[PDB]
């Protein structure tokens, strides 16, 4: 979720995780992915 990306050092987006980074979870509900 939200807060385990953002204090896990990851970015929630709803894209493709950007270039060096991986799907590491997800956010808003589901909906987004947690990227790290």
């Given at each position: 979720d939200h807060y385990n990306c953002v204090s896990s050092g990851g970015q929630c987006l709803?894209?493709?995780?950007?270039?060096?980074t991986k799907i590491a979870g997800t956010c808003y509900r589901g909906k987004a992915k947690c990227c790290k």
């Open positions: 709803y894209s493709a995780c950007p270039i060096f």
